[PDB]
Amino acid sequence: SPPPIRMGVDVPDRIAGVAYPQGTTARRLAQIGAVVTHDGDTLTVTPPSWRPDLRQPADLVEEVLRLEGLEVIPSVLPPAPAG
Amino acid sequence: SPPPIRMGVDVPDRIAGVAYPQGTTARRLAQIGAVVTHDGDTLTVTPPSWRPDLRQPADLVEEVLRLEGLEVIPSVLPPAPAG
Numbered sequence A, B: 001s002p003p004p005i006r007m008g009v010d011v012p013d014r015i016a017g018v019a020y021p022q023g024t025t026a027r028r029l030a031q032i033g034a035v036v037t038h039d040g041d042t043l044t045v046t047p048p049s050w051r052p053d054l055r056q057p058a059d060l061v062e063e064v065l066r067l068e069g070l071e072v073i074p075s076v077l078p079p080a081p082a083g
């Protein structure tokens, strides 16, 4: 197994701009074959041996979002500073 | 005397973008000749008879800001929406 990954439980929610139902991240990361232990607000994710691409939290964020579906992500125009 | 005017004590601070020291609004408004009474966060200002121009909270804000000096107002570039 690759080394374990530490990630805040709401990190996929922040990247997506979507409040996912409770347990969505741990469930999705379990589906792809990773062992997920819950420690307060920090998940400890150990990806399976067939997923060496999962090395950082951003890698784990992609697994959650792509299984929940990118269509749920809303469209929010950012304000850029005065150029 | 004109009718009295109700205004939040920090309304001049909000318009100016400056946190004035405690009691600045009440003191400045007394100087110009108005009777000021407190009630929590609301001031009741009765302008003097020689100031029929003082009719709305914005009129009182001008008195506070111009006596404190407009030079203390900082420069904050507002973010406009995507045009």
Ligand SMILES: [Mg+2]
Pocket (backbone or CB within 6 Å): A053, A059, A062
């Ligand atoms: Mg990836």
Ligand SMILES: [Mg+2]
Pocket (backbone or CB within 6 Å): A053, A059
């Ligand atoms: Mg990568």
Ligand SMILES: [Mg+2]
Pocket (backbone or CB within 6 Å): B053, B059, B062
């Ligand atoms: Mg005026």
